[PDB]
Design an enzyme around this catalytic site. Sequence first.
Site, PDB file in Angstrom:
ATOM      1  N   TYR A  80      12.385  32.468   5.874  1.00 37.39           N
ATOM      2  CA  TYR A  80      11.482  33.256   6.555  1.00 37.39           C
ATOM      3  C   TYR A  80      11.217  33.324   7.908  1.00 37.39           C
ATOM      4  CZ  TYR A  80       9.204  32.691   1.875  1.00 37.39           C
ATOM      5  OH  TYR A  80       8.929  32.767   0.570  1.00 37.39           O
TER       6      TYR A  80
ATOM      7  N   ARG B  86     -11.849  -0.615  13.067  1.00 38.95           N
ATOM      8  CA  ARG B  86     -11.601   0.245  11.811  1.00 38.95           C
ATOM      9  C   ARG B  86     -12.388  -0.422  10.530  1.00 38.95           C
ATOM     10  NH1 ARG B  86      -5.243   0.586   9.616  1.00 38.95           N
ATOM     11  NH2 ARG B  86      -5.609  -1.613   9.553  1.00 38.95           N
TER      12      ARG B  86
ATOM     13  N   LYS C  19       0.864  -1.188  -0.008  1.00 35.75           N
ATOM     14  CA  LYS C  19       0.038  -0.044   0.148  1.00 35.75           C
ATOM     15  C   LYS C  19       1.056   1.217  -0.050  1.00 35.75           C
ATOM     16  CE  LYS C  19      -0.461  -0.081   5.155  1.00 35.75           C
ATOM     17  NZ  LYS C  19      -1.286  -0.916   6.191  1.00 35.75           N
TER      18      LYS C  19
ATOM     19  N   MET D 127       9.475  26.389   0.747  1.00 41.11           N
ATOM     20  CA  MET D 127       8.492  25.297  -0.082  1.00 41.11           C
ATOM     21  C   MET D 127       9.489  24.504  -0.963  1.00 41.11           C
ATOM     22  SD  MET D 127       5.520  26.372  -2.579  1.00 41.11           S
ATOM     23  CE  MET D 127       4.372  26.950  -0.999  1.00 41.11           C
TER      24      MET D 127
HETATM   25  C1  LIG Z   1      -0.535  -1.889   6.557  1.00 42.74           C
HETATM   26  C2  LIG Z   1      -1.147  -3.118   7.203  1.00 42.74           C
HETATM   27  C3  LIG Z   1      -0.477  -4.327   7.382  1.00 42.74           C
HETATM   28  C4  LIG Z   1       1.137  -4.241   6.970  1.00 42.74           C
HETATM   29  O1  LIG Z   1       1.559  -3.550   8.496  1.00 42.74           O
HETATM   30  P1  LIG Z   1       3.267  -3.290   8.883  1.00 42.74           P
HETATM   31  O2  LIG Z   1       3.022  -2.835  10.377  1.00 42.74           O
HETATM   32  O3  LIG Z   1       3.790  -2.271   7.890  1.00 42.74           O
HETATM   33  O4  LIG Z   1       3.733  -4.721   8.769  1.00 42.74           O
HETATM   34  C5  LIG Z   1      -0.939  -5.329   7.423  1.00 42.74           C
HETATM   35  N1  LIG Z   1      -2.271  -5.405   7.301  1.00 42.74           N
HETATM   36  C6  LIG Z   1      -3.192  -4.325   7.523  1.00 42.74           C
HETATM   37  C7  LIG Z   1      -4.583  -4.587   7.697  1.00 42.74           C
HETATM   38  C8  LIG Z   1      -2.737  -3.194   7.364  1.00 42.74           C
HETATM   39  O5  LIG Z   1      -3.491  -2.091   7.168  1.00 42.74           O
HETATM   40  C1  LIG Z   2       7.351  31.455  -3.685  1.00 39.15           C
HETATM   41  C2  LIG Z   2       7.717  32.660  -3.974  1.00 39.15           C
HETATM   42  C3  LIG Z   2       7.161  33.773  -4.269  1.00 39.15           C
HETATM   43  C4  LIG Z   2       5.614  33.886  -4.063  1.00 39.15           C
HETATM   44  O1  LIG Z   2       5.276  34.022  -2.734  1.00 39.15           O
HETATM   45  P1  LIG Z   2       3.864  34.055  -1.914  1.00 39.15           P
HETATM   46  O2  LIG Z   2       4.222  34.564  -0.573  1.00 39.15           O
HETATM   47  O3  LIG Z   2       3.319  32.842  -2.200  1.00 39.15           O
HETATM   48  O4  LIG Z   2       3.300  35.406  -2.658  1.00 39.15           O
HETATM   49  C5  LIG Z   2       7.703  34.871  -4.910  1.00 39.15           C
HETATM   50  N1  LIG Z   2       8.996  35.008  -5.341  1.00 39.15           N
HETATM   51  C6  LIG Z   2       9.941  34.082  -4.774  1.00 39.15           C
HETATM   52  C7  LIG Z   2      11.384  33.947  -4.889  1.00 39.15           C
HETATM   53  C8  LIG Z   2       9.274  32.830  -3.950  1.00 39.15           C
HETATM   54  O5  LIG Z   2      10.271  31.831  -3.498  1.00 39.15           O
HETATM   55 CL   LIG Z   3      -8.494  -3.662  10.270  1.00 40.86          CL
END
Ligand SMILES: *Cc1c(COP(=O)(O)O)cnc(C)c1O
Ligand SMILES: *Cc1c(COP(=O)(O)O)cnc(C)c1O
Ligand SMILES: [Cl-]
Lengths: 392, 392
Positions: free
Chosen positions: A276, A150, A51, A324
Amino acid sequence: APLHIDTALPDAAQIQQSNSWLEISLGQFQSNIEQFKSHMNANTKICAIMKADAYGNGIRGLMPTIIAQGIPCVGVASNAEARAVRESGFKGELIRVRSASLSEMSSALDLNIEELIGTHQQALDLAELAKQSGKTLKVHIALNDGGMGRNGIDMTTEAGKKEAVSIATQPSLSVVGIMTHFPNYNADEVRAKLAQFKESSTWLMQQANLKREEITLHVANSYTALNVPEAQLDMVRPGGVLFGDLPTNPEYPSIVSFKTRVSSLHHLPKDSTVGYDSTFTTSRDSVLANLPVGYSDGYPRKMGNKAEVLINGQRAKVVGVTSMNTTVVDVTEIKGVLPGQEVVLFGQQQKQSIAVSEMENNAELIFPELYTLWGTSNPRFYVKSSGHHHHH
Amino acid sequence: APLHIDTALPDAAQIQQSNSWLEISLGQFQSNIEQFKSHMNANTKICAIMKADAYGNGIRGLMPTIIAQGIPCVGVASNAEARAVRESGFKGELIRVRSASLSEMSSALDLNIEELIGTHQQALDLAELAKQSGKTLKVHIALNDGGMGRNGIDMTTEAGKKEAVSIATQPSLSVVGIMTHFPNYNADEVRAKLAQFKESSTWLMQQANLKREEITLHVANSYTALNVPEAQLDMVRPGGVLFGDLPTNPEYPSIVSFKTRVSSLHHLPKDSTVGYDSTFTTSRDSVLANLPVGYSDGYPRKMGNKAEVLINGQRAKVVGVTSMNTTVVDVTEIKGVLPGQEVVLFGQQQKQSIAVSEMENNAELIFPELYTLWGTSNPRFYVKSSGHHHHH
Ligand SMILES: *Cc1c(COP(=O)(O)O)cnc(C)c1O
Ligand SMILES: *Cc1c(COP(=O)(O)O)cnc(C)c1O
Ligand SMILES: [Cl-]
Ligand SMILES: [Cl-]
């Protein structure tokens, strides 16, 4: 979840022009599977749980190993995952490990999924899909003996038992499995709940006239399969341990590394702010490495001023809050740093390593919260290396 | 970042069989752009910032609006984003808003990106790419007057000034812009730093014999463009406000909603545990809604026992910690709930709404940390609705 899991495996040139990426150790995955296998009883079989696009590691790149290893069953969550599994050529059992909407189940009929049901309405809906498609659909009944509350049917009341019997006797379905799942890694609690599961599943099979030898009883995730061996039963459902994320069992190393590269090197004098909210100010004339990775790639804002990354085999502090798309690292006292050098965000580099516990503490997340979103947000490259005629 | 941004827009049937998805209000996006435009001075122009696949909202679905609105410039971060922008037919200015590796820059040459440079080595590398491709490449010089200490050249020392002049006089490059960026929303600090930027950029243009009327000076993100209008200069760089994420300016509503549906309804008696670590126990006979969304879709573990979702126009508590793929909600006192009903995880439903502040407090993340990963991990559907001959 992604609507489609990209069909192509990124090639080397594609990775070279990517900002950040995951490196997946195929040899470590192979080794983890073989090691896990060595602890399984003769009478159990393995359902590899894939998954969230194989826990971020990528179904398409990992399926050839699953097939080569002869694993008989795979578990998935989304339809896109089910498609990626069948598109590898895998012709074994495919189970869904969660409740799925009627729309999901209906659109997946050609994939031969065995759905996981815990309510009468799910049984009724699947019976109708079976009727309309002129066949009998195979299902697993989820029971609530583990106490997940669940996907299962709780049978601790008369009403719950009655509903379970209705699920198990539904015309046009073939009950091929009965399962539960455990909420923690407490071996004594698991043993107590296992005993209750045996009682509940026995009772249900009697009431519904099911034949024990035609039903796969399965309860064990990775932890349980290895640490409560009497819970292996007819099939185990390991996910995390195959990928090297079972916290109790460090002898299965993680298969994932998260990498980027130094884009540019910037000289900043003493008393210069970074990032920032100006949360960091240099205390000395500095050289900062600018990395084109940020929280939109899954490297969280909280890493700033806490985490270290590995560059040229040395730890370097992340300074300022993560942007970001960009992270700034202090390389003032690291020699040999040049643009283009590889940076390890999680993983090993020369003699240094970033521990899982380290990642969790800095991100304030559990490890799978990080790596599942790494996998939707970055390409995967499958590294294959060892010694002679060997995978790892 | 994703290596490729999927070319196809999800259709209605595809969304129907998705577990969870984003609904993007195209009318709200259009309205936010028009409202923003109304506050821009005659002498400025707009560079719409579309990094992180348009802030999770999806470049491919939004570009036709950008084109229809005649926006002259777009900013991106990754090569995949640059490709998606050019593939829409957009023939305007395309700028990169971060430092990018030499490998990234080289592979993007056919996309006509104007790179953002703040170091001598970047200038040297780009000059060589220019020479090898038989042209002059257009660049923006990032200055550090804003104090981000990130992509720019700091000019507060003699060495920094000398490096800036070397960048600005590099043979085979055409300097088309000079920029900075501000680290907070403090209007008085922005004004002080704007004055310094004017001094630094004037000095640099004098030293490098650049002609002011051929250079675009740009410093303003969304906050700055609207709240320090004297900083609009020749071009503004709004990202967040176009998408309705400018915390200071709630008059631009968010364009994104995150949705799932009720997969199944489960009866659980009083004193039943839910979820990993059994962090919740029912205090009454309950009906729980099982939703096929979890932290691998970007709905964090911390939402459990804190957040509410909207079902049938009513708030319902998320109980137990979020699983990788599944969330459980208490619908005991919500009437009319049925499998298949839509669930709002973020957004509005009838008279209820989940606030951004609500999401942030529950997730312990800032809003863009959530939505950028929503966008890599779920399909987008672009809803188009209003009244007559109107977008919204
Ligand atoms: C994801 C999950 C698993 C696998 O779990 P792990 O702890 O990653 O081994 C097995 N059965 C169900 C129902 C799950 O949701
Ligand atoms: C992402 C970013 C922007 C846009 O910023 P906002 O706060 O989402 O408007 C402009 N210039 C630079 C250099 C950025 O990294
Ligand atoms: Cl379950
Ligand atoms: Cl910057």
